[PDB]
Design a protein around this ligand. Structure first.
Ligand code: GTP
Ligand code: MG
Lengths: 1340, 251, 277, 50
DNA sequence: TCCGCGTCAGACTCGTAGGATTATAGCATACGTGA
DNA sequence: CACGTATGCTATAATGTGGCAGTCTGACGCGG
């Protein structure tokens, strides 16, 4: 085990050895964007792909052209930190080398005329953070990967479209990545049609005529041959035995000298095998059998040279006679059968109105451009530009690949443009499916659903930007002079920059990162969405796609998706699942050879998985031999049953891989209903970090992985000893073995302190190492907001009893002890941001002075000279944070105010009052202030004090960098000088500034001194230019919105304690609202005297079927039992030996404990630090389906001297008497959800009103009235409450006269109703007359 | 109207009216200039297109779109559908003297009572407190009454206590499926921000306290108060109107 | 049947003849000399040119059809002011008028708030300058960066970029969800709540009671100066028009009415209480 | 499904029993969110006619 | 008279957050109000 | 006059247009 794990080991009840470790959880985001910016030389990727796609472009004239060489990202002018504070996007400038080449029109392609090559700026692209977010306008945002229908081909069929006939119409759809859709479909009369972009319907054969196919060739393509030889007088026919099948013999079938079948006799298997084995090729037949056979090719009379019969024409006795006498004694007819080989194309040619290729191109042209006069130029251009142009059509590699595999081809890769072969092959396969050989696919199958990560979407928008600019470029290249015009004068950045900012901003998939919780972040970045551009709609979504698909196994969680209208479409990725190179989802599986289960792992795509049989992970292995039991539970073809051991091809890697990350954190998930578990995994994400990060006693093991991989925790880059711990930073000195020979080798991690989250929660990093501690690489140095010693800590475990209590836990209502509030453990920190904008108006600039009309000295006490509140100042609702005054224009003062101001004199000043004050009922401490001033406006005195702070703080930060780096660097030169001329204490006597003159013999170590000397000077000048940059940015006057002169941002910190109406839950989907905070005296307490923290209602278990919560409680109690026993042994101070004995016996309890943890390796001191942590309660891991069994939990309870029932005797705090029976008592790990009653409580009597409708506004942030909706109205109608209703329609809403008159009546006690007409009705009438409908009121 | 930031925001009708006026006046011009007939015709088609767009946009063909892609909201659209005048602003309304909060159990409550947060009730009964403050002579004027309630003075709580006695308040839960979705109670002032609901009427509201919220409405007039106390009071409305059965049943 | 306004118009223009130089000169000689037919045939023949130059100025303000009509109006000015005797071709001359008229129309109708040509053209040179600045400064340009390049006031640049601020639709719904838009948030600021309306009633009615409480000559002289009971808001010297006819005794009696009323507000419970207001 | 769940919640489900449970569950939940619109539209029609 | 295309509906309250884009030559003459 | 707002003219020849939509559904009428 590692050093951080030596401090606290989690006890594992898992039994299956984990062959594959949890991968990096934020893989998707980082790989994808990495591929977008990754400049690929040949195999175009991301930007590179975008440039090669559009470029090189030429002018409309064709003489002048723009070609692309190479691009570069400039390094970001502001880092992540400065971007977040300032509110700017973290981006890199895109500089692109482009070569304007011009051709001579006099020479053929005179390329040596004018070549102008230079580097053009066009837009800054947002950069992805270390943790897979983007910082847009100073807010962390995540782009969710998308799930859409894969480009390729797809065979489908509405099962009984016309419900009257109920006939199955099969269709094909070719879906490209870019271009028109090409649809093939059957009609009721079995005629093949073609439609482009679901336009008007066309006979399918018309498209083949556009590809230049004569009728003869079309029949030769879709149909076989039946040959008719005309010998002597009798007609002969070339026979294939296995055609005459399931049919009736219409005439007497005989061959050479044996009669097989008579007239009207059914031709069975036997007759066919008889005929085949007899070697029958020709059979004599009646001439009358031909009437109805269709001739395949043309036949002409060689004598006359005229058409005897055209292709696809039904033969008769007369045609046959004329054919014989011309000299044709062989006739190709179509092979056709009602049942097996359907004559579809044959009938479709009779429906085809077109004749030749031109006629077909015209008809196609006329479909898509109806009415407009056709030309040949236009028809050819349109048809080639549909599916045969590099420019407008591209299947992509994925499309061509899926297309070829669906058509059973061998070749994966190929052309993005449709070849003639492609179209025909699709039509052929559609026809095969109609015939009954082959099946239709389904859209929900993950073999047809592809995942599109960020980088591909950024690439797409970036192409659009280039296409928009390309329009401008071609238009200016046409009129442009060749010589004066520079390439960058034609390019515009605005369109590209606009397309990309519109993606990372307007897009549905780009949203505010859900960061109220490490798990919330990590699950949000591993989200898949079927919505947004190129996707389905909430309105447009059926139920098929939503429901759990068999392919979802090991790829997508069945148990993670919102219970909203977004129920099927939003989905978290499974744990071990990964994105295929082409974009399909894949899952690891252990290869089984000869029954022996190899440790070789294979990721199988959805399509590949169907083909093998996969054993379940729960199968018992024979210690690296094979399956123990001769029957094994496996699944293939999407369905599950028993198999033999040697039949098994593969096996599930992990028990966990079926579930997502969120669900994997639910212990005893095996005992919870999938519905409750869904709610549980969804609400775990809403858990707000408490003041004290408390680890969960009853964990799974994923806790460590989530905390570390989310990156909110500071982890060690390189192992070594900690040189300096601080609340603000951590310096670790690296070990010699890992420590590079160049630099000093001291890593400095600056910790991020109390910062605002997107949900206004508090993000703080605490250091979890001691000063001068040896640390391994990849250990947790500092905990993020909801993490404890590297494990995930989303809430807090506590002592719970399941029993009714006086109805204070009625329907999930929760009864909590005051003890919990007092201990401030559920207490939470909220950092809110208030801003004050000084704008320039028509009347003049607003001022940020403390000089405001009508303000008490009490209020102005907390404002400084500038008019900004001091740091540290406690504020409450209505206190002024930033004083702001606005120029007021002329106002007609009512005659009363003329009189009153003449009495008082007090002429009201020209300036008003726009001061930013504390929102009403919020109360906090000002922890920070930021001031933005324009470049040129006179700075506030406070802005100047803040700049003094930032400058001196910056100087200290950089000074400490160069000091620790110089000390660490000379400490190395001191060791290099010892290898050669060791004079340890003699060299340190005279000053360290005069050291690097001292050399050594000409060796590799003399060259090491030279390296350290060159870097010391490098750092010396680097420190100068770094400080200059810092000073510039601190002086830099900020560019704000037009109109805005300066902006002051105040950050408040509010401490919210738990109270009735706050929402709390476990991880088994057990919700509750706190009803009451009970005094500790009243709380049920045990015989020992220890009172419960929470009383939950047991009536919320049997109905819910979330039994996970009960097992968690029993095990949590057992965990706390062991904790109380270690705590008792530490209070006594028995000795290291005795603690070691108890602790070893405890870790190695379980029937088949996987993890062995030997205490003999642990040194005495290491044992003491472990026991010290385990006294709070021994941390236990219950892997998802590989969890602790009841037997193991009761055994653990016995080690705690706790009851097997896990029920204990409890005493009523009030009466002192015992409760009638044992109550289940233990520790459930519980969460305070984001839903504080402080945020939900609202009330309004009278306020602002809407602009047109005049009814009050909506929402608590806009001080809104509750909507009394149609449903709410009907309720009053049922009751008969007529005045209450009228009241809510009139004096309460629109009626303007009514509301004021009513208000005055209420203040005068008389509750009189003085109603009128709602203004909304007045508006309705005006809107209807604006329509030109006369609607008048006829009065009384 | 001008937004704070010097921005302007306007109705779509103005973009549509601008289209119609420009094409109509251009038609007057083309007629003054005696233009050839094909041009006259195109302008008349354009005028019909713009009028059609103005009255009912997405009716005849492609609705005329903004830069956002989204089709401009026409006259017809402001009367038509859920977002239209009838459904949204006229058969149902935003309403004054309305509040909302989380609900929680009040097992101590009697069937005719509900726990009403002090801060919530102070603001819902604002004018009644001002009127009583002038009758006590505690407040000289309305501005003084306002400032006295902002300061939340001790005597103001005593007045609030006086006003809410015998004053019924409506509690409502979404969705309001039958009339019992709204019931009247006598309020009981409580310190703490959550509404306390009587257990036995949890059935009518279909209310379970897993984070459910409710809305509060103040009947203002003497008539409305008596409508609440007589018709809508929870004690008065026990039996389901659907079946002759008591809806208030222990659970 | 094609009912597309565009397609029908383009169909009609298609079946009208392209002219050669000599023919243009023959027609145009008679067109200047007043031949209703000549002008019409030259117009109808050269509509196709209008459409070709109408498909370049797209996605800027109005629709193709809109530009096609303004373009036509430019071509008509060209036919009116064409010189047949000059060797220079018609298509060359017309191109100028069509581009000119289209550009000018997209400069007055393209913006909801009509921007004068002067402001628009000013703003345009600021924009093109910003583009050259961004082409070499990698990062987009500041107000002062543009101002430094043109050697002009920062306030000039700022006021012009403020005007460029493009409008927001009141009906545009917020939060992607087509639910509540700007209209559903935006209050009527001018229409005060019943709270403020009732405060003014109480204020005005308290002054009535105060007027019936001060002396008869003090509330006469005080009220009619401020125009409370009088009709017009007069000054110390103008109160002489009524019966006062005084300059000093009006100022002594004005302030005497005010001093007794200041004690009426200290006793009722305002003075420093209603000083904050 | 031909193979039922032989286990119970106290006993604990395995990966395949749980996976099989999911379908029915999510169909149920999706029905709540999506079908209540049509039920409510029926309420609305009824109210309007009476 | 049937097919096919069109039009019409599709629960109720709460929430969050603000917001996007482009570009229209250059100069001479003409019209209306304050100093 | 000036300042702000507007109309106006330019002369190589140039003469028919063209970015998304993604397919929803069960029902009820309305021209061929
Ligand atoms: N209007 C509406 N109500 C919902 C929605 N989702 C859940 N609910 C309601 O919220 C409640 C949550 O489940 P419960 O009410 O506890 O279910 P129950 O009827 O008590 O049944 P058991 O849990 O089996 O005892 C149900 O009454 C649901 O009707 C929704 O999307 N819309
Ligand atoms: Mg509920």
């Amino acid at each position: 085990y590692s050093y951080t794990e030596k401090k606290r080991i989690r006890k594992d009840f898992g039994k299956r050895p984990q062959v594959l470790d949890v991968p990096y959880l934020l893989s998707i985001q980082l790989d994808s964007f990495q591929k977008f910016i990754e400049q690929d030389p040949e195999g175009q990727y991301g930007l590179e792909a975008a440039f090669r796609s559009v470029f090189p472009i030429q002018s409309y004239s064709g003489n002048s052209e723009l070609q692309y060489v190479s691009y570069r990202l400039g390094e970001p002018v502001f880092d992540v930190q400065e971007c977040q504070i300032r509110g700017v996007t973290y981006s890199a400038p895109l500089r692109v080398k482009l070569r304007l080449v011009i051709y001579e029109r006099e020479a053929p392609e005179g390329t040596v005329k004018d070549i102008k090559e230079q580097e053009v700026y066009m837009g800054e692209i947002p950069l992805m953070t270390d943790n897979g977010t983007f910082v847009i306008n100073g807010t962390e945002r995540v782009i969710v990967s998308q799930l859409h229908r894969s480009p390729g081909v797809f065979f489908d069929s509405d099962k009984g479209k016309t419900h009257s006939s109920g006939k199955v119409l099969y269709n094909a759809r070719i879906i490209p990545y870019r271009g028109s859709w090409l649809d093939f479909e059957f009609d009721p009369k079995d005629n093949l049609f073609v439609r482009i972009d679901r336009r008007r319907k066309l006979p399918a054969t018309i498209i083949l005529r556009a590809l230049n196919y004569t009728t003869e060739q079309i029949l030769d393509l879709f149909f076989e041959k039946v040959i008719f030889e005309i010998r002597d007088n009798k007609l002969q026919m070339e026979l294939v035995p296995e055609r005459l099948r399931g049919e009736t013999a219409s005439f007497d079938i005989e061959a050479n000298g044996k009669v097989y079948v008579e007239k009207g006799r059914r031709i069975t298997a036997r007759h066919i095998r008889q005929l085949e084995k007899d070697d029958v090729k020709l059979i004599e037949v009646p001439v009358e059998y031909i009437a109805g056979k269709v001739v395949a090719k043309d036949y002409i009379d060689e004598s006359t040279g005229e058409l005897i019969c055209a292709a696809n024409m039904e033969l008769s006795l007369d045609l046959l006679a004329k054919l014989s006498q011309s000299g044709h004694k062989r006739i190709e007819t179509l092979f056709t059968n009602d049942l097996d080989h359907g004559p579809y194309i044959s009938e479709t040619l009779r429906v085809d109105p077109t004749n030749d290729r031109l006629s077909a191109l015209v008809e196609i042209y006329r479909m898509m451009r109806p009415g407009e006069p056709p030309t040949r130029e236009a028809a050819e251009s349109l048809f080639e530009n549909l599916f045969f142009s590099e420019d407008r059509y591209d299947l992509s590699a994925v499309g061509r690949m899926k297309f070829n595999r669906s058509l059973l081809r061998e070749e994966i890769e190929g052309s993005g443009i449709l070849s003639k072969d492609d179209i025909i092959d699709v039509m052929k396969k559609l026809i095969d499916i109609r015939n009954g050989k082959g099946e239709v696919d389904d859209i929900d199958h993950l073999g047809n659903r592809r995942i599109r990560s960020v980088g591909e979407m950024a690439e797409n928008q970036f192409r659009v930007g280039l296409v928009r600019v390309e329009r401008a470029v071609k238009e200016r290249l046409s009129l442009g002079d060749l010589d004066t015009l520079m390439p960058q004068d034609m390019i515009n950045a605005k369109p590209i920059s606009a397309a990309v900012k519109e993606f990372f901003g307007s897009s549905q998939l780009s949203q505010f990162m859900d960061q109220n919780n490490p798990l919330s972040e990590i699950t949000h970045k591993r989200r898949i969405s079927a919505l947004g551009p190129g996707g389905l709609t909430r309105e447009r979504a059926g139920f098929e796609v939503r429901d759990v698909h068999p392919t979802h196994y090991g790829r997508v969680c069945p148990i993670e998706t919102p219970e909203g209208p977004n129920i099927g479409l939003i989905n978290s990725l499974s744990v071990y699942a990964q994105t295929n190179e082409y974009g399909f989802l894949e899952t690891p599986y252990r290869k089984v050879t000869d029954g022996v289960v190899t440790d070789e792992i294979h990721y199988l795509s959805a399509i590949e998985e169907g083909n093998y049989v996969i054993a379940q992970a729960n199968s018992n292995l024979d210690e690296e031999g094979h399956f123990v039991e001769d029957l094994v539970t496996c699944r293939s073809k999407g369905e599950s049953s028993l198999f033999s051991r040697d039949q098994v091809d593969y096996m599930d890697v992990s028990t966990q891989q079926v579930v997502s990350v969120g669900a994997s954190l639910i212990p005893f998930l095996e005992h919870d209903d999938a519905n409750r578990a869904l709610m549980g995994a969804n609400m775990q994400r809403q858990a707000v970090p408490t003041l004290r990060a408390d680890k969960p006693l009853v964990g799974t093991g994923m806790e460590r992985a989530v905390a570390v991989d989310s990156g909110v925790t500071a982890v060690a880059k390189r192992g070594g000893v900690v040189q300096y711990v601080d609340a603000s930073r951590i310096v670790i000195k690296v070990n010699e073995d890992e420590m590079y020979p160049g630099e000093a080798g001291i890593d400095i991690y600056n910790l991020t302190k109390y910062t605002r989250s997107n949900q206004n929660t508090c993000i703080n990093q605490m250091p979890c190492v001691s000063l001068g501690e040896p640390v391994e690489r990849g250990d947790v140095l500092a905990d993020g907001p909801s993490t404890d010693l590297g494990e995930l800590a989303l809430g807090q475990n506590m002592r719970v009893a399941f029993m009714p209590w006086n109805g204070y836990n009625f329907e999930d209502s929760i009864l909590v002890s005051e003890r919990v509030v007092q201990e401030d453990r559920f207490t939470t920190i909220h950092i809110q941001e208030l801003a004050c904008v000084s704008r320039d108006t028509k009347l003049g600039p607003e001022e940020i002075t403390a000089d405001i009309p009508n303000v008490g000295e009490a209020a102005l006490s907390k404002l400084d000279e500038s008019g900004i509140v001091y740091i540290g100042a406690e504020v409450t609702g209505g206190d002024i944070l930033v004083g702001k005054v606005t120029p007021k224009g002329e106002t007609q003062l009512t005659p009363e105010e003329k009189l009153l101001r003449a009495i008082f004199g007090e002429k009201a000043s020209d300036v008003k009052d726009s001061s930013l004050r504390v929102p009403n009922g919020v109360s906090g401490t000002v922890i920070d202030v930021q001031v933005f001033t324009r470049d040129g406006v006179e700075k506030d005195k406070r802005a100047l004090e803040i700049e003094e702070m930032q400058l001196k703080q910056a100087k200290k930060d950089l000074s400490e960098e160069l000091q620790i780096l110089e000390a660490g660097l000379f400490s190395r030169i001191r060791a290099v000088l010892v290898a050669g001329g060791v004079e340890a204490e003699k060299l340190d006597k005279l000053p360290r500034d005069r050291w690097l003159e001292l050399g050594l013999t000409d060796e590799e170590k003399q060259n090491q001194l030279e390296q350290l000397a060159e870097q010391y000077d490098e750092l010396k000048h680097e420190f100068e230019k770094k400080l200059e940059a810092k000073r510039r940015k601190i002086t830099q006057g900020d560019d704000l919105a037009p109109g805005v002169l300066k902006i002051v941002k105040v950050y408040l910190a509010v401490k919210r304690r738990i109270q009735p109406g706050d929402k709390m839950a476990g991880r088994h989907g057990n919700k509750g609202v706190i009803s009451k905070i009970n005094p500790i005296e009243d709380m049920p307490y045990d015989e020992n005297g220890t009172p419960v923290d929470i009383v939950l209602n047991p009536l919320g278990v049997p109905s819910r079927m979330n039994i996970g919560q009960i097992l968690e409680t029993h095990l949590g109690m057992a965990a706390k039992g062991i904790g109380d026993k270690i705590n008792a042994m530490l209070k006594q101070q028995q000795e290291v030996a005795k603690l070691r004995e108890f602790i070893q016996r405890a870790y190695d309890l379980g029937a088949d404990v996987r993890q062995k943890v030997d205490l003999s390796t642990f040194s005495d001191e290491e044992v003491m630090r472990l026991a010290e942590n385990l006294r709070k309660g021994m941390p236990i891991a219950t892997p998802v389906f590989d969890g602790a069994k009841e037997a193991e939990i009761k055994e653990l309870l016995k080690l705690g001297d706790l009851p097997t029932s896990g029920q204990i005797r409890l005493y009523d705090g009030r009466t002192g008497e015992q409760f009638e029976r044992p109550v289940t008592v233990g520790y459930m790990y519980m969460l305070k959800l984001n839903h504080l009653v402080d945020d939900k409580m609202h009330a309004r009597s009278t306020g602002s009103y809407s602009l047109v409708t005049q009814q009050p506004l909506g929402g608590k942030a806009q001080f809104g009235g509750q909507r009394f909706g149609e449903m709410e109205v009907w309720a009053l109608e049922a009751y008969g409450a007529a005045y209450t209703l009228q009241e809510m329609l009139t004096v309460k809403s629109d009626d303007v006269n009514g509301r004021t008159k009513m208000y005055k009546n209420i203040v005068d006690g008389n509750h009189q109703m003085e109603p009128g007409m709602p203004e909304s009705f007045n508006v309705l009438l005006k809107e209807i007359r604006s329509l030109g409908i006369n609607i008048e009121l006829e009065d009384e | 109207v001008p937004l704070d930031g010097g921005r302007f925001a306007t109705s779509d009708l103005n973009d549509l009216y601008r289209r119609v006026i420009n094409r109509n006046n251009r038609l007057k011009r083309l007629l003054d200039l005696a233009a050839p007939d094909i041009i006259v015709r195109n302008e008349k088609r354009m005028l019909q297109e713009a009028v059609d767009a103005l009255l009912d946009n997405g009716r005849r063909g492609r609705a005329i779109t903004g830069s956002n892609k989204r089709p401009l909201k026409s006259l017809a659209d402001m009367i038509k559908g859920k977002q239209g005048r009838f459904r949204q602003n006229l058969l149902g309304k935003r309403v004054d003297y309305s509040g909302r909060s989380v609900i929680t159990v009040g097992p101590y409550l009697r069937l005719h009572q509900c726990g009403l947060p002090k801060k919530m009730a102070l603001e819902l009964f604002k004018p009644f407190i001002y009127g009583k403050l002038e009758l006590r002579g505690l407040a000289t004027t309305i501005k003084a009454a306002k400032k006295m309630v902002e300061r939340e003075e001790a005597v103001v709580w005593d007045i609030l206590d006086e006003v809410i006695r015998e004053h019924p308040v409506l509690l409502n839960r979404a969705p309001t499926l039958h009339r019992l979705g709204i019931q009247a109670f006598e309020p009981v002032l409580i310190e703490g921000k959550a509404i306390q609901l009587h257990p036995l009427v949890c059935a009518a509201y279909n209310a379970d306290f897993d984070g459910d919220q409710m809305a509060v409405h103040v009947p203002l007039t003497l008539e409305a108060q008596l409508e609440a106390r007589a018709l809508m009071m929870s004690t008065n409305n026990i039996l389901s109107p659907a079946n002759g059965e008591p809806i208030i049943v222990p659970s | 049947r094609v009912l597309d306004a565009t397609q029908l118009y383009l169909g009609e223009i298609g079946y009208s003849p392209l002219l050669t130089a000599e023919e243009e000169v023959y027609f145009a000689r008679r067109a200047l000399r007043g031949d209703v037919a000549s002008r019409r045939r030259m117009i109808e023949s050269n509509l196709r040119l209008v459409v070709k130059i109408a498909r370049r100025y797209g996605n800027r303000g109005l629709a193709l059809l809109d530009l096609i009509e303004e373009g036509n109006l430019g071509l008509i000015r060209a036919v009116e002011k064409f010189d047949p005797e000059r060797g220079f071709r018609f298509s060359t001359y017309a191109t100028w008028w069509i581009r000119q008229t289209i550009e000018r129309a997209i400069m007055n109708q393209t913006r909801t708030i009509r921007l004068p040509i002067h402001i628009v053209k000013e703003l345009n040179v600021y924009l093109r300058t910003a583009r050259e600045l961004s082409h070499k400064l990698d990062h987009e340009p500041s107000a002062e960066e543009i101002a430094e390049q043109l050697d002009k006031p920062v306030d000039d640049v700022s006021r012009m970029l403020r005007l460029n601020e493009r409008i927001t639709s009141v009906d545009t719904p917020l939060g992607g969800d087509s639910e509540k838009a700007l209209l559903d948030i935006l209050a009527d600021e001018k229409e005060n709540g019943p709270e403020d309306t009732t405060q003014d009633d109480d204020m005005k009615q308290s002054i009535v009671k105060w007027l019936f409480e001060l002396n008869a000559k003090q509330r006469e002289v005080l009220a009619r100066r401020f125009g409370l009971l009088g009709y017009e808001a007069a000054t110390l010297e103008d109160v002489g028009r009524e019966i006062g006819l005084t300059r000093e005794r009006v100022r002594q009696i004005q302030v005497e009415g005010l001093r007794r009323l200041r004690e009426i507000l200290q006793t009722q419970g305002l003075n420093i209480e209603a000083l904050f207001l | 499904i031909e193979t039922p769940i032989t286990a119970n919640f106290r006993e604990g489900l395995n990966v395949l029993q749980y996976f099989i449970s999911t379908h029915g569950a999510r169909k149920g939940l999706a029905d709540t969110a999506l079908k209540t619109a049509n039920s409510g539209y029926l309420t609305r029609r009824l109210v309007d006619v009476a």
